[PDB]
């Protein structure tokens, strides 16, 4: 990658000096060799220099090989031979440390890359190829820092800290340690309940969720230097990792042996600090099932303070280990951990955004920085409030990196071009078309030169990307999951949501601002996008909203789950009836409801007609609706901040079937409105409860649809037709006065906006079928199904 | 085979010059040769030079070993012999550069298929016959594009890219990719979303359903060239596959050590790219088991960004990543996914189509290419748009060709001659019979040479098919499943429906266009061939329509699935008090209806007396009105946009059983009707919903036996009686007046045409096995059941 | 169920067997050479009621199945007598 040693790049444009000052449009291999030997003291240059291969050496066997006279250098990049070498030598510093290429690498790779006129060189100058590669290695010591060897105290600790595994003081004495950021609080908290002559085990609990080991490094560190209380002398820090215990073993009897062992060296007692990752797995306690119970001989360990450990695991787990006893009320002990707040988050970020600037588009933006964490933790959201953030920084963070390819000027028309003539041109040569190739040639190579010389004009391309991040480029990219594509989706969300549910209007532009309020981030990050009660009759734009929920906001059409609370019947267990009884609670809970919103999060859930169940049901949902979680099956906490949560109901029928007619009222239709929103939610209140619906955030009442909702729900409808069946090439359109006709079916007290579906079905797919299959109409023709009679009239058109 | 290079054909007719040039009836090989090298520089040809071995060597040594003097070249096609030196220097041309076998293979599987005549002359001619094999193969070298390898490149890479497994790009660079037809929008996703840093990893979900592999093909294309932020430079790409890691080892603990180790390896971090198919099985989140648990290793290593990866996953997968945290939710990220739309589908065929050149019977016709891809979607139904498609060009892709072994020219019959010619011939050779044996074989040998001939007239059946595909043949196809074989049974549905179904004609002919309007398209493509509610008496032709459905449709009676709903009643009958629960809509959900249709993915589900079920079955079928799908068993979408779900009902029955009867006037059978036409479709509907009604696309009312529906469908039970019987010889008939008779059983309003059956026992089978066991009829003699004083007479007819 | 390459690969064919008639041929077809089973060839209305007897009582076996037990066990049975 970028940012390599200078030493490889200055051996490097020595060559291209040579490239035209001995007259090659090419900066050889030839050129590369006097490069290293001119540029003298390089490792590959002072090597070259031992075995007597000195420039003058070289060059007098380089003009020998090719040497003059094409000064005017052509094309001035490398050969192809070169160029391997250079791609080889940058690997071959990946392979002898420095990442970051330099000399001694490219006269290594040049040897191993060894070829063309560069190998023959020195092979002629009395210098084996090896003997060159020979001594830049013996020249090379590579690069490293923190280690060159020369003996420290050991004893007892010799088979101990052999065997198992990771010592994090050891990468925090060679100092490659990056922090990592604090998760501060907790490593003071380790050391009271470490050192220690009884108890001696701290047990972090919390979040997982924050990158345990950045409060690890922060522990390595400070157990070594030097506030910690001698009470444990020498101090020594071992990891035990179960990972390697399981490799390379298939049975469970040899994986205790080699712990009993471990445990047997873990003598060296009241001086070591034992770190324990996964604790609960080993403990084998809690529950109907452990997880392995190497417990029994841990316990003892654990209590002696020989294997005194930290243990990494989770809020539950301390307990279920104190549940077991009696080493683990004189052994474990718990301590609460710390994970970088919601602002503190951003600052993390922060923290190695200006390295993945080795992606080279971030480095910064700050705004942008923020834009992530802000942005993602109301609207997706699937993830813990600081992960979601960094993930979307570095994805705009190679989005908008591809927008700068797309757009300079748009001088991807450069490559355009060269590609249509190397195309011509070779398919020319293939044929030949000799000079008929040539001229496309030409003009291809033309183009190429040009082409490289306009990506490095791509520097712009660079100057671009590399530090934009910003707000919408974030936002974008959260967007993408889910400023920039969530805002036109906010400010347009009334009319998108419209857009998709013509079907009481009123309804669509409350729930679009609801939702636009809490996708701005004006709301808890402890709730819901939406809390709702839908009341209405049957599916008016109730469930179609739903729908264009998912729609504006989500991406796709639907991003929507849709589980009908009727079957948790629960207080309604006799007053509908159903096929399987046994379960209600138990199944939202225990499984059904559960799973499927934990498989896309950020689903708009819609429960219809809740009232056909207990209140009991509704303190779950108002759990959701206050805690922003879900307490549910495996144990999860499912985060409700993504879904949008609309409940339908029909609760209050009798009022709700009573219409709200634009062709009858307007004023009796705002009343019929009015009527519902009042007694309909008072029979809200005994199917549900006002705590439920205090925790619930608006209720949406829904009106059985006026004249003039419904036609223009049959005009998508119609064009739904209209287009499914273009697709296999036969048009239909059906007349204003068509849809208006097929749009009176979903008038009724009790409907809403599905019939609208059977009478598209039968006036227009239907119709038309038993009109193709007659020769009324026919393929491509466009069918216009009409009113001419009140009725439906076909009448064609082109 | 596969078609072949020139100088393989080029070798050969030079033999059949020198069969008749020298005399040689049957073209040896002898003549293969000289044919050899008389081809001159071919590789074979060549490589006998090099033995020494001129055309004039061979052909002194040849003419006196056959040579003279059979100029008359009786039957001149090969020796079996040389037959045998091409067919197995094809499979050698296969094993050595040449798809299309040349010359090289000639000689070297001449070598191999040394014997005889050609043998002979080359170790006469002092050149051993492996010296000769050895010769042509020595002039080889490398064909494959790309490849011919002679450079260096590169270091540090080595020991991860090994282990393990495809790469993409590999054969890309020896370029035998094909694209191919996006599929396109996953992958401009995928490039944000890995040039990342913290999270780093493309997580692509659903459609698997496209051929995921396929948009793969896409990725490798764009991570290469050009648009990519720059830690998307300098990688490397390696495709990551269970299957090698599985194969050759037993135990899940070898498979483990691997995969840790392969993680490790992995190191090569910010520069390397690992695909991960089926990435759900290694994370194991969640469920009751997701499968093996590597997400252990596998969820950091994705996390840290050296197993930096692009997730190829499903729609319930999702799921098991997000539930992890937070190197599973700082891993994942969903990108939307797309396939190459119904128009697309068409031209991925098409261009594959003609590929089929090997296949020789399409290459096209493109309007058959269509019709496989456009009736497919509803013409079973339940897969993806292409992959159906392909199914029918290429069986109709053969059945044309089939076609063939019968009347088109029909040049058949000579080779049903010269078979026949053989027999006579053969065992006269075997008795002897000897010049009667002769004038057979002279019979037979004079057909042979004739079929070989037309033989090759028979290239004429390719010159006949390798266009069309046939559009009709495609047709016919789907529908052999599921114009040819599916227009007869679109056009006389009705007559095809009547011809089992005469319980009620009305509803025939509706049934027959509802059917028919869907199966020639004009529906929704997410809704059944038919939904319907059958009103009547119950099996009044309800049920045998359902039979007639099958019948007229698939060419089987029946592929007819059948459920009582009224057994999951739950509206009359579920529990009580403090008795135990039952589980009717879990049996029906939960996986009993659904698993069955599933079956026979394309059925008539008859779905007996609903109106007895409480109005939550029907949600169920609404699934499959509105979806064309039916959730259920295992997160399965069963695509019920293929069944014909047809549901029979009577609520309003005493309309339905005082239904349309033309025996107690036409003027009774318009105003029983017109009764049973509004007060049974609304006890329908009040035994539904009108919104199960509202996609529901028609209620037919079917009417006991008027006068009229009864004496037909008995004289075909009572004929399917005496046809039943012949079979194993024995000859009844009822007369139209024994028919008539027993036809009268059911023309009470209140049953169907179900009590019929009794009727054809009582009178047919009963009546008859009464009197044929005393001897008053007979095996095979002509039994006479007539009715000759209003009681049936069995009368005795030779 | 699995699909596209095993739903849309894989397409169904309707198989056949000789008529019950047909049966009694099949059962005749071979009878000759149960004369390494000495009984049966005879008589035709021997194969006939193997068949024809068994379809519907015994009734444990498919159509052309049930015959050939009688067949064979009568094609000694008698030859026993």
Known sequence: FGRFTERAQKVLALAQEEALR?????????????????????????????????????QKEVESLIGRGQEMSQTIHYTPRAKKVIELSMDEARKLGHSYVGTEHILLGLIREGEGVAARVLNNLGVSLNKARQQVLQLLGSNETGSSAAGTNSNANTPTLDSLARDLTAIAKEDSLDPVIGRSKEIQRVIEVLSRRTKNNPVLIG??????????????????????????????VMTLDMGTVVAGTKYRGEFEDRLKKVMDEIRQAGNIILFIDELHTLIGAGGAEGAIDASNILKPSLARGELQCIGATTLDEYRKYIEKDAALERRFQPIQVDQPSVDESIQILQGLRDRYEAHHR?????????????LSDRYISDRFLPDKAIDLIDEAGSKVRLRSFTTPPNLKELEQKLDEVRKEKDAAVQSQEFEKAASLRDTEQRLREQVEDTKKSWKEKQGQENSEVTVDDIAMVVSSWTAQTETDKLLNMENILHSRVIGQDEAVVAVAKAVRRARAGLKDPKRPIGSFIFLGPTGVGKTELARALAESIFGDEESMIRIDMSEYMEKHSTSRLVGSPPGYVGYDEGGQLTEKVRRKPYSVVLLDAIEKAHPDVFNILLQVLEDGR?????????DFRNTILIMTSNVGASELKRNKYVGFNVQDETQNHKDMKDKVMGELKRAFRPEFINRIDEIIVFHSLEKKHLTEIVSLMSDQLTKRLKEQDLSIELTDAAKAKVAEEGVDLEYGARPLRRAIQKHVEDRLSEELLRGNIHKGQHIVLDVEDGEFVVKTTA
Chains 1, 2 share one sequence.
Not at 207 to 235: C, F, H, M, S, Y
Not at 631 to 638: A, E, F, P
């Open 362 to 374: 971030v480095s910064i933006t700050d705004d942008a920085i923020e834009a992530a964490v802000k």
């Open 207 to 236: 979040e997982p969720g924050v990158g345990k080991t950045a409060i690890a490094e922060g522990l390595a560190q400070q157990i070594i230097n030097n506030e910690v209380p001698e009470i444990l002398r020498d101090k020594r």
């Open 22 to 58: 001995l007259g090659h449009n090419n900066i050889g291999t030839e050129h590369i060799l006097l490069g290293l030997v001119r540029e003298g003291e390089g490792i590959a240059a002072k090597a070259l220099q031992a075995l007597g291969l000195g420039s003058e050496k070289i």
């Open 630 to 638: 879900l307490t549910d099956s495996k144990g999860r906490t499912v």
